[PDB]
Design a protein around this ligand. Structure first.
Ligand SMILES: [Mg+2]
Length: 616
């Protein structure tokens, strides 16, 4: 739940590449760290070209459509399961109809088009003559059902000598985001184009749905506000309503339909909340699998209720309602393989590692339950990881860091917004209401958080948080919104350790006792003191104890390192002279000090290697 949550610090990249990214993208070290990890190296990686991908079958499919168009063949388009299928059919129906095709959607012909996976057929989609990326060996792009519908319309335009159908990219982007596909490469380019087109969409229904929810150009608004309204219509048996909203040019009719989608989404929300309220209190503890039955539950809402349970629980979840079954899983437990282990009991089933579906006679539920519970018992418990980009910079640099991270957008399945680590004794704490919600400060940075039952923060905390630009009264404030918060604990990261932090007091005691020790030529005061006290002074490559940092690398060592408390070595804590790669140095310094204070051998060792480099 929370005791199976591991925090890890992303590795430091090699300095020459870190520098290359900072230069080629014109950003400081923090943001460059993020870009390096997400594979962004040159300026054109931030803005990939939106191009016509060479998917297998794409050309034949477009040729077929050109024939259908010219010969006036009757085209029927199918795809209404969710936002991805609906936006994809809206693209093909509007697009082909704009070219003079006799096309119509099929909500349950000479050519049949099916979106999201005589009479010729084109199965033009993605999801698990078929046009599909996976058929294209070595193509590293993951377009969705709507993405492929868009590519197909584009392939046809190319054949017809027409320009790229960019006005359809907003519909395509909505389906892409809704499908939760990785937002990189072609998908990143498509989404950037489409998100930009929504405010003045050629499709009045989409523009109106977007305004209704307060759209401001963010992928996250599509994911949490737009797509759910569209999906609710379908989950509730009114997919035609959503499809029609995307096809009409009559603003009044669209306005009315937006009202309808709002009502369907409110219904979905109500049912979902009642199901979760009834189910969440059940069979959850430390069971290897949560398996619940809700005889009269609505099959249209159990999928989300299952994901919500899995999230509160960090366990695979299987729900059965009215003989239909849904599975959400994670970690090393495959959803569909768990169903496979109990397949003799099912009427039918299918799916993948994280989600699966089935049908089954509810009378077999107890048997189904023991079986899947046993399947899950064969595996280690699932664990959640929180990936930390780096230690948060000083307050004075937050605005610039924030503006530099901006280019990473759109955030999504592909590149989640980065999380920074903050550490310290909270101060100026102040509740907000009567529970969880509160605010406090760490090293002058204000952080907002929902304290997991307890309230009152330990004397020292660790925070994984999002750097936020909060506006109010026409003014901006750079703060941190905590996603996770805890008493300091195991922290993953760093390289194979060779340098082991030791408190200055302990180090000096051993040095006075005669332990072979190294004191750097710097801080002549420390050196003088050492000499002026009888320390057994040695060069770093031979002393197993250090009171400071050597100027150049000394590897194949395994040493204990102390800096001080008033030592000059510790004076790597002085504020710099910003802007240039002085900030790279500053990042390394803050890392060194942090890993030193936390006695973290791996991070300190890693940081020390970067330290030798940033000085070469
Ligand atoms: Mg899809």
């Amino acid at each position: 739940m929370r005791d199976r949550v591991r925090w890890r610090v992303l590795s430091l990249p090699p300095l020459a590449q870190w520098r290359e990214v900072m230069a080629a993208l014109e950003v400081g070290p923090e943001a460059a760290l993020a870009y390096w990890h997400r594979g962004f190296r040159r300026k054109e990686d931030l803005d990939p070209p939106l191009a016509l991908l060479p998917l297998k079958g794409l050309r034949e499919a477009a040729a077929l459509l050109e024939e259908a168009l010219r010969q006036g063949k009757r085209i029927r388009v199918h795809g209404d399961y969710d936002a991805d299928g609906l936006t994809g059919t809206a693209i093909l129906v509007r697009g082909l109809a704009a070219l003079g095709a006799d096309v119509h959607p099929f909500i349950p012909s000479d050519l049949f088009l099916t979106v999201d996976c005589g009479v010729e057929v084109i199965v033009t989609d993605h999801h698990t003559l078929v046009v599909h990326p996976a058929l294209t060996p070595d193509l590293k792009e993951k377009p969705t059902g709507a993405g492929v519908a868009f590519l197909l319309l584009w392939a046809l335009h190319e054949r017809l000598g027409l320009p790229p159908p960019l006005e359809y990219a907003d519909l395509a982007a909505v389906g892409t985001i809704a499908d939760v596909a990785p937002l990189w490469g072609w998908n990143r380019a498509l989404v950037k184009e489409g998100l930009a087109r929504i405010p003045a969409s050629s499709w009045v229904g989409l523009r109106l749905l977007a305004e209704a929810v307060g759209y401001t150009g963010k992928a996250v608004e599509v994911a949490f506000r737009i797509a759910p309204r569209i999906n609710a219509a379908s989950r509730l048996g009114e997919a035609e309503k959503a499809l029609r909203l995307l096809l009409t040019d009559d603003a009044a009719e669209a306005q009315a339909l937006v009202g309808e989608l709002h009502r369907l989404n409110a219904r979905r929300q109500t049912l979902e909340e009642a199901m979760l309220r009834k189910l969440l209190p059940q069979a959850d503890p430390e069971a290897k699998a949560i398996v619940l039955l809700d005889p009269e539950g609505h099959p249209g809402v159990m999928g989300i209720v299952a994901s919500r349970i899995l999230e509160a629980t960090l366990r695979p979840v299987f729900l059965v309602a009215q003989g239909k079954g849904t599975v959400r899983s994670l970690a090393p437990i495959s959803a569909v393989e768990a169903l496979r282990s109990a397949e003799d009991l099912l009427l039918r089933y299918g799916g993948h590692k994280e989600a699966a579906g089935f049908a089954m006679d509810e009378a077999l539920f107890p048997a189904f339950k023991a079986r899947v519970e046993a399947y899950a018992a064969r595996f280690p418990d699932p664990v959640r990881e929180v990936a930390l980009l780096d230690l948060l910079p000083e307050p004075g640099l937050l605005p610039q860091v924030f503006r530099e991270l901006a280019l990473l957008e759109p955030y999504g399945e592909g590149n989640p917004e980065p999380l920074f680590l903050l550490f310290g004794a909270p101060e100026e704490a102040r509740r907000l209401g009567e529970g969880r919600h509160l605010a406090f400060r760490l090293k002058g940075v204000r952080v907002l958080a929902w304290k997991q039952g307890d309230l009152a923060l330990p004397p020292e905390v660790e925070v994984a948080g999002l750097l936020s630009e909060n506006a109010w009264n026409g003014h901006l404030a750079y703060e941190v919104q905590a996603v996770d918060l805890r008493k300091p604990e195991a922290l993953e990261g760093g390289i194979a350790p060779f340098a082991y932090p030791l408190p200055l007091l302990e180090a000096l005691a051993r040095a006075r006792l005669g332990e072979g020790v190294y004191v750097p030529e710097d801080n002549p005061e420390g050196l003088d003191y050492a000499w002026k006290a009888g320390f057994r002074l040695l060069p770093p490559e031979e002393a197993g104890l250090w009171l400071g940092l050597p100027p150049r690398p000394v590897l194949g060592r395994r040493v204990e390192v102390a800096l001080g408390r008033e030592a000059r070595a510790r004076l790597s804590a002085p504020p710099v002279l910003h802007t240039p790669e002085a900030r790279l140095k500053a990042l390394v310094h803050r890392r060194l000090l942090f890993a030193y204070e936390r006695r973290h051998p791996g991070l300190f060792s890693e940081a020390l290697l970067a330290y030798w480099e940033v000085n070469r």
